[PDB]
Design a protein around this ligand. Structure first.
Ligand code: HEM
Ligand code: 243
Length: 465
C-alpha cells in the first residue's frame, strides 16, 4: 500500500478543540462528526480533537482509526500502551475509587493487572452455577413489573425498572446476596448512577442546552467529595457481601481493601453500567427487527427448551442459532462502548484499506468502534441489522470482526491483554435476556428515545405466549 500523510488538523489553540467539541456533542453528534470528516479527508484515518479538552484533559489531539483493518492495532499490547486511558485523554480522580488505580486503568506490564484480572476470572467462574437460576428469577420479576406498568399506563419504561433488576441479579449471582436484605435496600442504582456521572460527565451530554452543559459538565471535573458518602455505602456492601471472593483475593496476594474497590468497580461500573447500555439497545434493535423475527426467535427458543426437557442449560443455548446470531448482531451493529484508546509505544505503520500511515511513538490512537464494525469493506449489508448474519459456518467466521470486548470475538481475554474480563459472561447474559423475552412473549412493540449513555425504551405491547 502507498504511504499517505495522515490528513486532518487540530485548528487553533483553545478554539479548535472547542469547535470540534460542539460538533461532537451538539451540531453533528458522534457518528456524523466522524463520517463527515471521513468524507472531507477521503480517509478512515485522520487527525482530530476529542472531548473533553478544556481543563479536564491535557491534550485532546488523537489519530482516529475508523475502519476494521486499522482499528485492531488498538488491541496489540506490543504496539500500544494501555495505561490510564480507559476513559480516553483524561482519567477520573483516584479519589473516586478509594485512592487506587483500578484494574481497568492498568497496563498489562503492571503486576497487579495480572492479579486483579485473575480475581475477576475467579469471581465469574465461581458464579457459574448461580447465573441461570438467579437471572431467571430476577428477570421474571422484571417482566411481571413491566406487564403491571403496561396495564396501568399503556406503556412500560424499561430502563427505570431494569436497572434495579440488573443490580439485584449481580448481587445474587456473584455474591449470593439479595440487596433487599442489606442496608443498600433498593438504593444501588441511584448511588451507582451518580458515581458513574462523576466519572464520565466530560464525555456525555444530558440534553441540557450547551450554554448550561458546557460550563457545568464539559469544562471542569465535578468534585469527588460530593459522591464520597454514596460510594461508601457501596463499599460497605461489597466489603460485607464479598466474603468468599475476598478469600481468593487473599490467596492471589491482593489486599482486602484493594480487592474490595476493584470488585465494586467491576460489578458497578464495568458490569452493571455495561448492562445498562446494552440491554435497552438490544430491546430497541430486536424490536425494530419486526414481528416475523420475534416469532422465529420464539419458535426456536421454545422448541429448543422443549427438546431439552424444559431445562435451560449452556448446551441448549448452543442449539439456538438465530438467538446466538441476533446477540452477536446487536454487539456488531451497536457496540455498547464506542471509544477505545491506545498510545503508540514505538513508531508504527498502520495499514488501512487503501493506504498505510506512519505514527510516531507517543501519539494517542483512538478508534470509534461502530465504524470498524459497520465497515462495508468487511461486512455486506453493513448498515443493516441482519438477525441471521452469524448463522452457519461462514457466518461464524465473521465473528473475528465483532469487537465489542476490545478484541476479536473469536479471541479470549487473558492476563496478557486488555480484552474485557467478562467477555463470556456478557455474551451469556445477553443470550439469557433474549431467551427470557421470547419464552414469555410472541412479539412486542417499543417506543424509543435518547439517553445520556445508550437508549431509553418503553414497551407499548407485550404479546404473551
Ligand atoms: C455489557 C457489559 C460490558 C461491556 C459493554 C463491556 C465492555 C468493555 C470494554 C469496551 C472494555 C475495554 C476498555 C478499554 O478501552 O481498555 C472492557 C474492559 C474490561 N472489562 Fe468489560 N464490559 C462489560 C462487562 C464486564 C463484566 C461482566 C466484567 C466482569 C469482570 C467486566 C470487566 C472488565 C475489566 C476488568 C476490563 C479491563 C480489562 C483489563 O484491564 O485487562 N466487563 N469492557
Ligand atoms: C457506564 C459505562 C459502563 C461501561 C463499562 C465497560 O466495561 C467499559 C467502558 C470502557 C470505557 C469507559 C468509557 C465508557 C463511556 C461510555 C459512553 C460513551 C462511549 O460509548 O464511549
Amino acid at each position: 500500500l502507498p504511504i499517505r500523510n495522515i490528513p486532518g488538523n487540530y485548528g487553533l489553540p483553545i478554539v479548535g478543540p472547542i469547535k470540534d467539541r460542539w460538533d461532537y456533542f451538539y451540531d453533528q453528534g458522534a457518528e456524523e462528526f466522524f463520517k463527515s470528516r471521513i468524507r472531507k479527508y477521503n480517509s478512515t484515518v485522520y487527525r482530530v480533537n476529542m472531548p473533553p479538552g478544556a481543563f479536564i484533559a491535557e491534550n485532546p489531539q488523537v489519530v482516529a482509526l475508523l475502519d476494521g483493518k486499522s482499528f485492531p492495532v488498538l488491541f496489540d499490547v506490543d504496539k500500544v500502551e494501555k495505561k490510564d486511558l480507559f476513559t480516553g485523554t483524561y482519567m477520573p480522580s483516584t479519589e473516586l475509587t478509594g485512592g487506587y488505580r483500578i484494574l481497568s486503568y492498568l497496563d498489562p506490564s503492571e503486576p497487579k493487572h495480572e492479579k486483579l484480572k485473575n480475581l475477576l476470572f475467579f469471581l465469574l467462574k465461581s458464579s457459574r452455577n448461580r447465573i441461570f437460576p438467579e437471572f431467571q428469577a430476577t428477570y421474571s420479576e422484571l417482566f411481571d413489573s413491566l406487564e403491571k406498568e403496561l396495564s396501568l399506563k399503556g406503556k412500560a419504561d424499561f430502563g427505570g425498572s431494569s436497572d434495579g433488576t440488573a443490580f439485584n441479579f449481580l448481587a445474587r449471582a456473584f455474591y449470593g446476596t439479595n440487596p433487599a436484605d442489606t442496608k443498600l435496600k433498593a438504593d444501588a442504582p441511584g448511588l451507582i448512577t451518580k458515581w458513574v456521572l462523576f466519572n464520565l460527565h466530560p464525555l456525555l451530554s444530558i440534553g441540557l442546552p450547551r450554554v448550561i452543559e458546557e460550563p457545568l459538565i464539559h469544562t471542569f471535573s465535578l468534585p469527588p467529595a460530593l459522591v464520597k458518602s454514596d460510594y461508601q455505602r457501596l463499599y460497605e456492601f461489597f466489603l460485607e457481601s464479598a466474603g468468599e471472593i475476598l478469600v481468593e483475593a487473599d490467596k492471589l496476594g491482593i489486599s482486602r481493601e484493594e480487592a474490595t474497590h476493584n470488585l465494586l468497580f467491576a460489578t458497578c461500573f464495568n458490569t452493571w453500567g455495561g448492562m445498562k447500555i446494552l440491554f435497552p439497545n438490544m430491546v430497541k434493535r430486536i424490536g425494530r427487527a419486526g414481528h416475523q423475527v420475534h416469532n422465529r426467535l420464539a419458535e426456536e427458543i421454545r422448541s429448543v427448551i422443549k427438546s431439552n426437557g424444559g431445562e435451560l442449560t449452556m448446551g441448549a443455548i448452543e442449539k439456538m442459532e438465530l438467538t446466538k446470531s441476533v446477540v452477536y448482531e446487536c454487539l456488531r451493529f451497536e457496540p455498547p462502548v464506542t471509544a477505545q484508546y491506545g498510545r503508540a509505544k514505538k513508531d508504527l505503520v498502520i495499514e488501512s484499506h487503501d493506504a498505510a500511515f506512519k505514527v510516531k511513538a507517543g501519539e494517542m490512537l483512538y478508534g470509534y468502534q461502530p465504524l470498524a464494525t459497520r465497515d462495508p469493506k468487511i461486512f455486506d449489508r453493513a448498515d443493516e441489522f441482519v438477525p441471521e448474519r452469524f448463522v452457519g459456518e461462514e457466518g461464524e467466521k465473521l465473528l473475528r470482526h465483532v469487537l465489542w470486548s476490545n478484541g476479536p470475538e473469536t479471541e479470549t481475554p487473558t492476563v496478557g491483554n486488555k480484552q474485557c474480563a467478562g467477555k463470556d459472561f456478557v455474551v451469556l447474559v445477553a443470550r439469557l435476556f433474549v431467551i427470557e423475552i421470547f419464552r414469555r412473549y410472541d412479539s412486542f412493540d417499543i417506543e424509543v428515545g435518547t439517553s445520556p449513555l445508550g437508549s431509553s425504551v418503553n414497551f407499548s405491547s407485550l404479546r404473551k405466549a
